[PDB]
Paper text:
Anti-CRISPRs (Acrs) are natural inhibitors of bacteria’s CRISPR-Cas systems, and have been developed as a safeguard to reduce the off-target effects of CRISPR gene-editing technology. Structural studies show that AcrIIC1 can directly bind to the conserved HNH nuclease domain of Cas9 to abolish its DNA cleavage activity. Among the different Acr proteins characterized so far, AcrIIC1, a broad-spectrum inhibitor against diverse type II-C Cas9 orthologs, is one of the most promising engineering candidates to target the desired Cas98,14. In this work, we report the discovery of a redox switch for NmeAcrIIC1, which regulates NmeAcrIIC1’s monomer-dimer interconversion and inhibitory activity on Cas9.
Fortunately, we managed to grow protein crystals formed by the oxidized NmeAcrIIC1 and solve the crystal structure of the dimer with a resolution of 1.61 Å by using X-ray crystallography. In the dimeric structure, one of the protomers is rotated roughly 180 degrees relative to the other partner, which then allows for the dimerization via two intermolecular disulfide bonds. Strikingly, the two subunits assemble mainly through two parallel intermolecular disulfide bonds formed by Cys17 and Cys80, but not hydrophobic or electrostatic interaction that is commonly observed in mediating protein–protein interaction. The subunit orientation of the dimer is restricted to a great extent by the two intermolecular disulfide bonds, shown in Fig. 3c, d. Each subunit of the dimeric form aligns with the reduced monomeric form of NmeAcrIIC1 with a small RMSD of 0.68 and 0.73 Å, respectively. Second, by examining the electron density map of the oxidized NmeAcrIIC1, we observed that both of the intermolecular disulfide bonds are not fully occupied, indicative of dynamic short-lived chemical groups. Second, the estimated rotational correlation time (Τc) for the oxidized dimer is almost twice as that for the reduced monomer (11.6 versus 6.0 ns), whereas the trends of 15N backbone relaxation data of R1, R2, and Het-NOE align well between the two states on a residue-by-residue base, which reveals a rigid dimer with restricted orientation for each subunit but lacking large interfacial surface that is supposed to alter the dynamic properties of the residues involved. Together, the CSD and 15N relaxation data for both forms of NmeAcrIIC1 in solution strongly support the crystal structure, stating that the crystal structure of the oxidized dimer can reliably represent the dimer’s behavior in solution. Importantly, compared with the structure of NmeAcrIIC1’s complex with NmeHNH, the counterpart subunit of dimeric NmeAcrIIC1 occupies the position of the NmeHNH, burying the “hot spot” residue Ser79, thereby inhibiting the interaction between NmeAcrIIC1 with NmeHNH through steric hindrance. Thus, the dimeric structure rationalizes how oxidization and dimerization of NmeAcrIIC1 result in the disruption of NmeHNH binding and the loss of inhibitory activity against Cas9.
Author numbering:
A (entry chain B), B (entry chain A): 3 to 85
Write the structure that this text describes.
Amino acid sequence: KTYKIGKNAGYDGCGLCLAAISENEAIKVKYLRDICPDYDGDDKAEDWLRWGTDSRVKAAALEMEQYAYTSVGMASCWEFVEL
Amino acid sequence: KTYKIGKNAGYDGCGLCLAAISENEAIKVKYLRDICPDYDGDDKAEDWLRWGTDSRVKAAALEMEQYAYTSVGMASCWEFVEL
């Protein structure tokens, strides 16, 4: 599933990210490379097997989930794809 | 075919663009949205059917072609893909 990333959502190019989704749009994104500065992968979906249970990723997701449906995925050309 | 975009090549994120290619690298990119400010598409490959014969696009391409192999394509995630 694919969702447009708005212009005030924190977009910063391609990368694995969390997204908050509301009314068919990703209204906030948070990149794995910012949540976890020690992340050194090449943005492969399989990287979430390693990083998805990181306490920093869990904390970032819980903060967004208070307010909107949240999921792990990948950002590319202003679109968020759910993984 | 896909080429890494160089660091001083004019990269500005995602979008339809012309690229000059040298030694398996895109050493200059010029975005359609900058060449033609009236372009208002969603960076679909088919958009080049409308815009590829615009006189501003032909002029930008010929300028680069003087010095390097040039093609129309799409820039995303620091790579250029030929169309």
